A = this chain, B = another copy of it.
């Protein structure tokens, strides 16, 4: 019986793979707290010093993210991000690609560990020939208990797709990985072969990767057990249907169109796959994203477009004070509708984020209304996470990230008697709040039957007026959970309305005092009247009235 010691001896015996561009290794973690620390330790022991480790957590329920954050704090080579919703391993891979900075991209699962010479040999093979575009090395299956080799199809090690590494420019020419639960690695490899060519891919018959064999994994549907050291891997019915789906799609679609087909981030499936094969939100109604922008943050706005030009079906951009329409907005074409009020006296500032909503009231077009601010950096999984949370709450309540909770006895809105859960600050559990910041508000349009923008008497107070509108229709506001620094604020030394109205909040205080009650008195009746809000019931609501 061949063991992993034999694999290491064979790797050391072979001389294959023997400037230094930055290499980004992207790890995907999901409830793998037992193995992620070992995986990161194995990645940090690589002989290729000029590396960085981008780790993406697919909304783990265990302390995987805590271990990843601790290791990222120990050393500067590890940068860790967490997805607030479970979207599969390939969405995390694409997010890591977006967050990466190196010219070469490699992959490694969190539950698996790699040889301490994998990246060096793979980079040497990749850069040996200029025309080479990608390199892959053989992997193997191991039992974590006995450390023996789980032979697959009567072979110790076989060429795989998780070990495939390529240049950074590959993902900007043929798109990114297809956002599916499983089987997207084969599709991406075949896409590379169709676009560049089979001669552009290098193969390294060395067991440089070690897939840990654990139960209830993604590929267990392909496993037929013969004994403790031999398994048979055959594609399932859904996997075969997916495989036949894209092979015909590769032939029926031009290669240069691939960049226009698999754009990331995305919220719709690029291929007709069943629900059990895709973990994307896949909304059944059009998605509208509304955002207001001032010129002083125009560059930030561009970045938002670079993260939201594909995560919606329609845009509503309110340019407040702009002189001319920016190029990145007019490039969207009919997808974006722009409000270009050039007068500050007649301007409505943040209230423009609700303009399209009024039109939907006159059209009864169901959708997922999203409101965003131009000073917030949004992640690649923001829209999918918001839609998933809305579906989890059955679209019966408005959700947000910037939560504000104040009692009904408060005499000053910006006093110390309010509690603020910022969008860039972590939240362990979902909490119902009185006021949600409109920069992170997502809600289904069908929740509101009648709405008019003229009810928003004062500009710059969108949060208070939106909370009043939600309270009038008895619609709950939920501050959903999120990891630390999920939405990193980017002020960039600009002017903010918080600094302007922090010491001059007379109108906000008047509205809060005149439109009570607040606190849990406005939450407990709404949270006690629905089973889906049972986990959101306040613990001791007798003081926070």
Contacts and interface: CB of A to CB of B under 8 A. Distances in A.
B35 A425 contact: no
Contact of A35 (B37, B215, B540): B540
Given A228-B530, A425-B73, A113 B543 contact: yes
Interface string A514-542: 00000000000000111110000011101
Contacts of A542: 4-5, 8, 147
A31 interface: no
Given A74-B420, A419-B74, A544 B45 contact: yes
A181 B421 CA distance: 35
Q: How many copies does the complex hold?
A: 3
B49 A225 contact: no
A455 interface: no
A295 interface: no
A115 B63 CA distance: 36
A482 to B, nearest CB: 11
A426 interface: yes
A543 B70 contact: no
Nearest to A394: B225
Contact of A529 (B42, B144, B227, B419): B227
A329 B16 CA distance: 64
Contacts of A419: 41, 44, 74-75
Contacts of A4: 542
A337 interface: no
Contacts of A428: 63, 66-67, 70
Contacts of A132: none
- The interface size bin for chain A is 35 or more
A38 B540 CA distance: 7
A248 interface: no
A75 B416 CA distance: 9
A427 B45 contact: no
Interface string A106-149: 00000001111000000000000000000000000000100100
A224 interface: yes
Interface string A223-262: 0110110000000000000000000000000000000000
B45 A529 contact: no
A70 B227 contact: no
A34 interface: yes
Contact of A45 (B45, B407, B532): B407
Contacts of A228: 528-531
A212 interface: yes
A422 interface: yes
A528 B115 CA distance: 24
A417 interface: yes
Given A35-B540, A422-B74, A224 B63 contact: no
Given A225-B531, A228-B529, A530-B228, A540 B73 contact: no
Interface string A54-70: 00000000010011001
Contacts of A70: 425-428
Nearest to A37: B539
6 tightest A-B contacts by CB?
A38-B540, A38-B539, A227-B529, A4-B542, A42-B543, A113-B540
Interface of A: 4-5, 8, 34-35, 37-38, 41-42, 44-45, 49, 63, 66-67, 70, 73-75, 77, 113-116, 144, 147, 212, 215, 224-225, 227-228, 394, 396, 405, 407, 409, 416-417, 419-422, 425-428, 528-532, 538-540, 542-544
7 contacts: A44-B417, A70-B427, A74-B422, A113-B540, A147-B542, A212-B540, A225-B531
